[PDB]
Amino acid sequence: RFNTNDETKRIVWTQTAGHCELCGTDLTFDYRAGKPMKWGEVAHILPASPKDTANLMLLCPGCHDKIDRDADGYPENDLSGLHQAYLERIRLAATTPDGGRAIPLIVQSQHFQTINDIPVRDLLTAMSAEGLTAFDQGIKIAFAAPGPRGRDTTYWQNVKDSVQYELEQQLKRRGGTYGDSPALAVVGLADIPALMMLGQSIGDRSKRLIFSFHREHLLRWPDQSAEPPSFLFTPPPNGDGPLALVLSISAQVPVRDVTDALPGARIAELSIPEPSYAMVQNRRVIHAFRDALQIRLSQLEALTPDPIHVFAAIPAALAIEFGALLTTQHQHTYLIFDRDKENQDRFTQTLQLGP
Amino acid sequence: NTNDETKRIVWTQTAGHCELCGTDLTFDYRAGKPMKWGEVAHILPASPKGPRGRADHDAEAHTNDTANLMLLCPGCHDKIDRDADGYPENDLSGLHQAYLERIRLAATTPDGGRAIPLIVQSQHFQTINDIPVRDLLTAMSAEGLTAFDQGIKIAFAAPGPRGRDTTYWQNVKDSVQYELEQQLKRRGGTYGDSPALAVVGLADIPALMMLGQSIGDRSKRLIFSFHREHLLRWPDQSAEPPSFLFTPPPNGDGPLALVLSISAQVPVRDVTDALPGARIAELSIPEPSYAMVQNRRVIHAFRDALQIRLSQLEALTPDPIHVFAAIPAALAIEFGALLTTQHQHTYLIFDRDKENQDRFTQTLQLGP
Amino acid sequence: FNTNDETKRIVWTQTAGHCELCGTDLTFDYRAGKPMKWGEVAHILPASPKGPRGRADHDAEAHTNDTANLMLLCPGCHDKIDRDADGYPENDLSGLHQAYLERIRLAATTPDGGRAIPLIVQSQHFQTINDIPVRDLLTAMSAEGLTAFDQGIKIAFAAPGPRGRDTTYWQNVKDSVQYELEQQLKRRGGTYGDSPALAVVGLADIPALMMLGQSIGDRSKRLIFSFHREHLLRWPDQSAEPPSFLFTPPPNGDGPLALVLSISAQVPVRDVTDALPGARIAELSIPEPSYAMVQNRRVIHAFRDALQIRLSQLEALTPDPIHVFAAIPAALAIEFGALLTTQHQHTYLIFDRDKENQDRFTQTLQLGP
Amino acid sequence: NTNDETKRIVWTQTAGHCELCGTDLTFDYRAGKPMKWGEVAHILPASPDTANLMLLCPGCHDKIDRDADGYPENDLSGLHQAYLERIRLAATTPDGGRAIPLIVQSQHFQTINDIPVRDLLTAMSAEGLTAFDQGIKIAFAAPGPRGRDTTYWQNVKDSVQYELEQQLKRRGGTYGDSPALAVVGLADIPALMMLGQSIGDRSKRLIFSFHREHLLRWPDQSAEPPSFLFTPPPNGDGPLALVLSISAQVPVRDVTDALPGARIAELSIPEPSYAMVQNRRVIHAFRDALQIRLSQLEALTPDPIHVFAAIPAALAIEFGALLTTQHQHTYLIFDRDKENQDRFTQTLQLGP
Numbered sequence A: 001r002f003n004t005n006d007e008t009k010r011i012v013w014t015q016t017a018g019h020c021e022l023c024g025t026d027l028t029f030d031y032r033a034g035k036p037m038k039w040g041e042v043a044h045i046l047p048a049s050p051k052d053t054a055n056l057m058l059l060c061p062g063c064h065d066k067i068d069r070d071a072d073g074y075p076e077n078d079l080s081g082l083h084q085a086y087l088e089r090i091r092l093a094a095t096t097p098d099g100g101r102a103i104p105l106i107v108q109s110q111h112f113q114t115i116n117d118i119p120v121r122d123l124l125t126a127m128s129a130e131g132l133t134a135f136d137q138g139i140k141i142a143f144a145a146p147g148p149r150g151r152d153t154t155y156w157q158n159v160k161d162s163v164q165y166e167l168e169q170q171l172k173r174r175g176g177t178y179g180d181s182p183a184l185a186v187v188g189l190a191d192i193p194a195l196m197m198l199g200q201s202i203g204d205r206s207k208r209l210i211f212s213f214h215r216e217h218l219l220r221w222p223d224q225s226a227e228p229p230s231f232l233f234t235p236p237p238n239g240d241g242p243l244a245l246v247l248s249i250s251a252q253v254p255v256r257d258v259t260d261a262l263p264g265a266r267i268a269e270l271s272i273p274e275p276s277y278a279m280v281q282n283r284r285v286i287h288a289f290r291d292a293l294q295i296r297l298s299q300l301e302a303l304t305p306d307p308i309h310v311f312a313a314i315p316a317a318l319a320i321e322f323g324a325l326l327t328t329q330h331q332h333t334y335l336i337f338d339r340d341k342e343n344q345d346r347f348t349q350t351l352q353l354g355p
Numbered sequence B: 001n002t003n004d005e006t007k008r009i010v011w012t013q014t015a016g017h018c019e020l021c022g023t024d025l026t027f028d029y030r031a032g033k034p035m036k037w038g039e040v041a042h043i044l045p046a047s048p049k050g051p052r053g054r055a056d057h058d059a060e061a062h063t064n065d066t067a068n069l070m071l072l073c074p075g076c077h078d079k080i081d082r083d084a085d086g087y088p089e090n091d092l093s094g095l096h097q098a099y100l101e102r103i104r105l106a107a108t109t110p111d112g113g114r115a116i117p118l119i120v121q122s123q124h125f126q127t128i129n130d131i132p133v134r135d136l137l138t139a140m141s142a143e144g145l146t147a148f149d150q151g152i153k154i155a156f157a158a159p160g161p162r163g164r165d166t167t168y169w170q171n172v173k174d175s176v177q178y179e180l181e182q183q184l185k186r187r188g189g190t191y192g193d194s195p196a197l198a199v200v201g202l203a204d205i206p207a208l209m210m211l212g213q214s215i216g217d218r219s220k221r222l223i224f225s226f227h228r229e230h231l232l233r234w235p236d237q238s239a240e241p242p243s244f245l246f247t248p249p250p251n252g253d254g255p256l257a258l259v260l261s262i263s264a265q266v267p268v269r270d271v272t273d274a275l276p277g278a279r280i281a282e283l284s285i286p287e288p289s290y291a292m293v294q295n296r297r298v299i300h301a302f303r304d305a306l307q308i309r310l311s312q313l314e315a316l317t318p319d320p321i322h323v324f325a326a327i328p329a330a331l332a333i334e335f336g337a338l339l340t341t342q343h344q345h346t347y348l349i350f351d352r353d354k355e356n357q358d359r360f361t362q363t364l365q366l367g368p
Numbered sequence C: 001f002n003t004n005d006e007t008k009r010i011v012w013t014q015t016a017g018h019c020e021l022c023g024t025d026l027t028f029d030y031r032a033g034k035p036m037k038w039g040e041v042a043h044i045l046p047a048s049p050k051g052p053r054g055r056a057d058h059d060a061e062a063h064t065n066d067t068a069n070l071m072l073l074c075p076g077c078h079d080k081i082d083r084d085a086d087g088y089p090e091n092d093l094s095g096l097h098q099a100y101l102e103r104i105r106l107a108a109t110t111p112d113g114g115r116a117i118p119l120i121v122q123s124q125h126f127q128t129i130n131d132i133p134v135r136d137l138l139t140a141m142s143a144e145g146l147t148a149f150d151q152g153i154k155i156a157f158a159a160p161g162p163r164g165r166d167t168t169y170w171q172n173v174k175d176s177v178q179y180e181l182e183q184q185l186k187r188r189g190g191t192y193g194d195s196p197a198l199a200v201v202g203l204a205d206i207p208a209l210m211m212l213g214q215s216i217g218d219r220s221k222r223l224i225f226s227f228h229r230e231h232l233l234r235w236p237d238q239s240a241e242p243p244s245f246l247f248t249p250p251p252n253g254d255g256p257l258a259l260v261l262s263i264s265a266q267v268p269v270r271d272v273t274d275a276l277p278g279a280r281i282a283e284l285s286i287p288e289p290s291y292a293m294v295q296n297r298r299v300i301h302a303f304r305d306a307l308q309i310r311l312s313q314l315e316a317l318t319p320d321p322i323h324v325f326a327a328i329p330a331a332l333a334i335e336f337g338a339l340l341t342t343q344h345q346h347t348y349l350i351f352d353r354d355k356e357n358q359d360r361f362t363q364t365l366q367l368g369p
Numbered sequence D: 001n002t003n004d005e006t007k008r009i010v011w012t013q014t015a016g017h018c019e020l021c022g023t024d025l026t027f028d029y030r031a032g033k034p035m036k037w038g039e040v041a042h043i044l045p046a047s048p049d050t051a052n053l054m055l056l057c058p059g060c061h062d063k064i065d066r067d068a069d070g071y072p073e074n075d076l077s078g079l080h081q082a083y084l085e086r087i088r089l090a091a092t093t094p095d096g097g098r099a100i101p102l103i104v105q106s107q108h109f110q111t112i113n114d115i116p117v118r119d120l121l122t123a124m125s126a127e128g129l130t131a132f133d134q135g136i137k138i139a140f141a142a143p144g145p146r147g148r149d150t151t152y153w154q155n156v157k158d159s160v161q162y163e164l165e166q167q168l169k170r171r172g173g174t175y176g177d178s179p180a181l182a183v184v185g186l187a188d189i190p191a192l193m194m195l196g197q198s199i200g201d202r203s204k205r206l207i208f209s210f211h212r213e214h215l216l217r218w219p220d221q222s223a224e225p226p227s228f229l230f231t232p233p234p235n236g237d238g239p240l241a242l243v244l245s246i247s248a249q250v251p252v253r254d255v256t257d258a259l260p261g262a263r264i265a266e267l268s269i270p271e272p273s274y275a276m277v278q279n280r281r282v283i284h285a286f287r288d289a290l291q292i293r294l295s296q297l298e299a300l301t302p303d304p305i306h307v308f309a310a311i312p313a314a315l316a317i318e319f320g321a322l323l324t325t326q327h328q329h330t331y332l333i334f335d336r337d338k339e340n341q342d343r344f345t346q347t348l349q350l351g352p
């Protein structure tokens, strides 16, 4: 055998997480089975190379005899390559909480910042529950109020440059074990058009987790277990009319309201069986919505080079993912219609994406 | 109180790190002394009036229950006990058990050899484009792949005021053919003669194809994929690859166009616009979807299908094959990997132009 | 032997509520977002002589409430110093304790000098790591009463390609200075106002830093900072008298007019005529050219005054462009460019050392109107 | 109109000074008097949440709040937020100490004088430099059958830089800054110069020097740098040799031997001593003097400068780091080959 002190044993036992390094057997199995843990009988510590605690291995008796066949406490072959690889896999898992370094971001409309102001703590506790760890004050920004020219292209561009400014400064704050940028923990509560621009700013090609505000559960997921709802599709009819995509997710949009604001519209509908305002039970719902949506958008874009007119009844989190989805190099024109308080809540064009 | 054996088990099963922040609790790196500075923290306290305390909780049973004990750094332990509402019982247990299983799965992962991590990302998007290093190494570790270092991470210079111009593609070419070769060379001694490359890319489709052609020879290439939902984790190891449907090109003369409707459906009208009179051959899947990269098998299926169709098309035209691709990043790399030596025909890669109303424009010519 | 509550409250007050050894905020939990006091008032010299750093000569009772013996530390830094007394000796902890409290005292007593946009511009044309720390720039600004709403802009030119600093390379520099920087200043626009001041530090290609200075020369409120091989972003000596700048006029003739700047080092005349045969050489120099000559911003101002009028004279002696062969610090390369921001600007051709041409001065960038 | 937590927060976030004048409002405690936190200071909103509350002294309070309504007449939000930003910057400074320990050595000095990482880490720790992972302890590779040719030295550089760059990727701190580099070297001078060639001098890098007695700790941090005396070279057509008599007086006879006809310019100190590196500023002092003279010598001739240095190890690394600019002048480094009675011999070429 190989002589070792108690500290050296406790170091080896700890760095290896109590598993044999060659076969992976959990050497703490006896304690788990209610038996006394004989640390010295259930495992042998020896050097990883023939002949520091960093070069000592933890082996089950069965594997020790296999690699130390002369019973001289030293391996016959140089097992340092496998040994270091083992410790590295353990180190990576043990440090995994480092990957939770995240940036809180709460984007609200001035209306909701005065009605349902989201406190940063509500997002931080929801983040903490999922292993997302903030390290500084969260970003809390409100969409600027539109001026005389309304929410023209300049307005929407300044909103994008503002959000991208705020997130780019914090994303520079790299850390962890590999210098990665922190994750973005983002929640939005604003009109659908503004939340789409929030998605346009953040994209979907970075470690970012969308959170959803709920009247009762706050930003905690009402049911991480719920199965995402089916996203059913109704294809558009034959014709030359303007192509309209109706999203009936939060509520069933009356197709009559869509053709009233867009006469002759060719209506394509993406819905869930029973629309409900709280249908965002967990983040997997948001992902499922994206997948189903992009599949249909590819089908609709193939049906026309003309703009796709969107009439959406979707929760806030889905409005963001929608916007984020449309951040590829490819860009098709989408004309976002929203119920306009200035026109009796009738659908009117609010935002144009892409060319 | 927790006995010594149970505390030793807590230290062992956690690998001596803080379960909430991941700090190494077995060593002081500032002064370099090995020391124990972690604390075995109780989720549910002994006294019902302690942090997370409850009336009918049996403090005698859970005093030595490993499901109730966490290895925490001194600071994290202070925080969870001084904000019991911010760190509720359910929150801690879920993270607690997730942390243990992550370690246990690493300990029981068979060694899969060494590989050089390679992240290649661009900046032609109007949003942040950043692939986390840890996620690639985690994905690798799940396959028994370890690295002597965190590997290579190349970011293409962003497009200048003129969009993706000649200067831009010159930089992309320099990044793939000079920067990468130089960083791989400097890793020559550490990784060996023919080391495996664990590659993940999220960059221009024409660029990823150039990357593939450059690494297409590097024996043992492990293409990983960035997924909008699962990031670097494979969405489904058990998912069966889809059918790669092919449409033969129309007989006659005209530029032979190769359209790939994989992540989405490429409207034919966009191809003929940038290449009129084109003879189009489409490789597609029944349901084009950004999310279709469920496992490396799907990538293996695409190369096998594409390999055949490239052979057919390459023997149907003398002139170049004009490519109009809507394909995931992982498959765009595998496209180029087939053009390294198994398909030495000239290929003209087109791509969407933000400065020309989304029209297709010629980008890189990939061939001998 | 116990620290009373008044003293512990002083310790928390004088440290700004942060750990003196790792700098974490001990007044707040950022993960869950609850204001909480998770710091500990640690004792450098312990009460018991057997404690970490214990001494028999130390009168425990006398210094139980002595701020000089009491450090606010996070719980982890406290365990480490007490579990490795050999590695954290009392004189090192005392020295760090005083350094930390003095830096707080200096911040609290700095008069408010306004806001400024931190701007870092660095290249990658060197064969070593070139990285200006962000904290060091912000700390130099704060030392001058300048604060910022964010950590500012940091632009890192693309590394040269396989062909060295080729045409593609200098195009990227142009795009980095004229497009990337302008785009990030526009995006900061609003937060900082209409005409915000720029706290700019550079360590990049001499021609690139001049083009930078030219771009930012119009935008007033320019505060140049300097990376120093010894003092980093801190000015070496605010009280140092700027050096005198000697101007050698050019000889009369029809040859190309060359401006030679010998400030960081003496530019050998043979190198200027090697690259520009028959050059009429005018020189601005300091008595002892040195890499470390930028002792304070007044040095940069002296270089401006010493040269502003001389550029007017030289432009009158030739209609052709002026060829610049400069061995100057990064901060002065930016100031030079800022001088080239006049109406009907005379053209300047910047030469630079060329690693591809055995260190010969090669023509790089042209700077004009 | 504030609670005791809000006051404790305002007092802790302002470090206990008035935000307008900067007086230490804890002065009464310093004078041995009980602290009347409520009588020595005023907490008042910054404009006509704790983030928008100011700590002021009574005198400064009576000036801004003249109408006694409890609010300022003018908006002091700009000054107040600037003050908190400055305090925050100072308090987080220990976070700017993230460093990478690098101990580069030759197998000879490694076997004869292995420098332990502990000794580097404790010296770093005293200067506020805090390592976050295992230190990098390297040994210069052994030469092949071609010796230490240009290939060997390019592998040395590529090896150091690859490992250095892998740890600099581990950004951190408050602004994502790359960690500082804490480096000590104990190897032959040419190898130490190539170490400097690798790290450069344009990044947060702090050299440490192994001292015979004081180890990796500085002998005297108050010691003023020595005067670096320069002897101009003789006029002639011979080879220009630069002799550095810093740790010892180089015998010109040994320079003439290795270089017949050498024109010797010398940089030395009044009393060459192996212990002259009393602190880092001595190294900075050596660089400045050296560069001022190298500029002078380079202007004399385009011919290569032959270096015969008797210098401490830390200075050898700084010399190598100094010659990392775009500009490059050929420098031929001569070391003593122990296989020739310690006769000087060219071992390394730095230049274009």
Ligand SMILES: Nc1ncnc2c1ncn2[C@@H]1O[C@@H]2COP(=O)(O)O[C@@H]3[C@H](O)[C@@H](COP(=O)(O)O[C@H]2[C@H]1O)O[C@H]3n1cnc2c(N)ncnc21
Pocket: A116, A189, A190, A191, A192, A213, A214, A215, A250, A251, A252, A253, A254, A276, A277, A278, A312, A313, A314, A315, A316, A317, A319, A339
């Ligand atoms: N035919 C039709 N019938 C009914 N509504 C229809 C419609 N056609 C379109 N709509 C609109 O679709 C969205 C449904 O409401 P929602 O709550 O499910 O989603 C909203 C939305 O994403 C965004 C902007 O709200 P608004 O502009 O009112 O848009 C509304 C509604 O007008 O904020 C979300 N939001 C509001 N309050 C919230 C809260 N308390 N908690 C969480 N999210 C909340």
Ligand SMILES: Nc1ncnc2c1ncn2[C@@H]1O[C@@H]2COP(=O)(O)O[C@@H]3[C@H](O)[C@@H](COP(=O)(O)O[C@H]2[C@H]1O)O[C@H]3n1cnc2c(N)ncnc21
Pocket: A204, A205, A206, A298, A327, A328, A329, A330, B202, B203, B204, B205, B226, B227, B228, B263, B264, B265, B266, B267, B289, B290, B325, B326, B327, B328, B329, B330, B332, B352
């Ligand atoms: N008619 C058409 N419809 C839709 N797209 C069309 C098209 N005609 C061409 N295209 C292009 O096909 C690619 C589809 O997107 P994708 O994600 O499936 O594949 C991309 C690609 O491989 C590479 C460069 O991106 P891009 O230049 O946008 O190429 C896009 C798009 O422009 O990065 C991948 N990528 C982007 N964002 C990602 C993310 N968030 N996560 C993981 N991978 C991501």
Ligand SMILES: Nc1ncnc2c1ncn2[C@@H]1O[C@@H]2COP(=O)(O)O[C@@H]3[C@H](O)[C@@H](COP(=O)(O)O[C@H]2[C@H]1O)O[C@H]3n1cnc2c(N)ncnc21
Pocket: C202, C203, C204, C205, C206, C227, C228, C229, C264, C265, C266, C267, C268, C290, C291, C326, C327, C328, C329, C330, C331, C333, C353, D201, D202, D203, D295, D324, D325, D326, D327
């Ligand atoms: N005959 C000659 N002799 C000496 N130099 C000569 C020459 N002929 C030309 N030159 C050039 O004069 C500049 C002197 O160096 P400097 O530091 O005083 O100024 C530089 C410059 O302003 C800019 C780009 O550097 P570079 O391209 O190397 O220009 C070098 C050098 O090539 O960055 C500055 N810079 C570099 N490294 C730095 C550091 N570590 N810390 C702070 N600032 C640093």
Ligand SMILES: Nc1ncnc2c1ncn2[C@@H]1O[C@@H]2COP(=O)(O)O[C@@H]3[C@H](O)[C@@H](COP(=O)(O)O[C@H]2[C@H]1O)O[C@H]3n1cnc2c(N)ncnc21
Pocket: D186, D187, D188, D189, D192, D210, D211, D212, D247, D248, D249, D250, D251, D273, D274, D309, D310, D311, D312, D313, D314, D316, D336
């Ligand atoms: N005429 C002449 N007279 C005296 N020396 C002369 C000479 N002509 C050349 N030389 C050489 O100049 C260098 C001065 O020695 P130094 O110790 O002051 O600095 C050395 C050097 O930087 C590097 C390589 O050492 P070496 O190869 O012996 O080169 C020696 C010596 O041979 O290691 C440093 N180093 C060695 N041991 C050390 C220790 N114990 N503590 C701290 N630093 C130590």
Ligand SMILES: [Mg+2]
Pocket: A031, A032, A033, A034
């Ligand atoms: Mg059991």
Ligand SMILES: [Mg+2]
Pocket: A067, A068, A069, A070, A071, A072, A073, A074, A075, A076
């Ligand atoms: Mg054996």
Ligand SMILES: [Mg+2]
Pocket: B041, B042, B077, B081
């Ligand atoms: Mg506890």
Ligand SMILES: [Mg+2]
Pocket: B074, B077, B078, C075
């Ligand atoms: Mg505690």
Ligand SMILES: [Mg+2]
Pocket: C042, C043, C078, C082
């Ligand atoms: Mg203590």
Ligand SMILES: [Mg+2]
Pocket: B074, C075, C078, C079
């Ligand atoms: Mg403790």
Ligand SMILES: [Mg+2]
Pocket: D064, D065, D066, D067, D068, D069, D070, D071, D072, D073
């Ligand atoms: Mg008042």
Ligand SMILES: [Zn+2]
Pocket: A020, A021, A022, A023, A024, A025, A059, A060, A061, A062, A063, A064
């Ligand atoms: Zn085993």
Ligand SMILES: [Zn+2]
Pocket: B018, B019, B020, B021, B022, B023, B072, B073, B074, B075, B076, B077
């Ligand atoms: Zn922790």
Ligand SMILES: [Zn+2]
Pocket: C019, C020, C021, C022, C023, C024, C073, C074, C075, C076, C077, C078
């Ligand atoms: Zn601390």
Ligand SMILES: [Zn+2]
Pocket: D018, D019, D020, D021, D022, D023, D056, D057, D058, D059, D060, D061
């Ligand atoms: Zn005052």
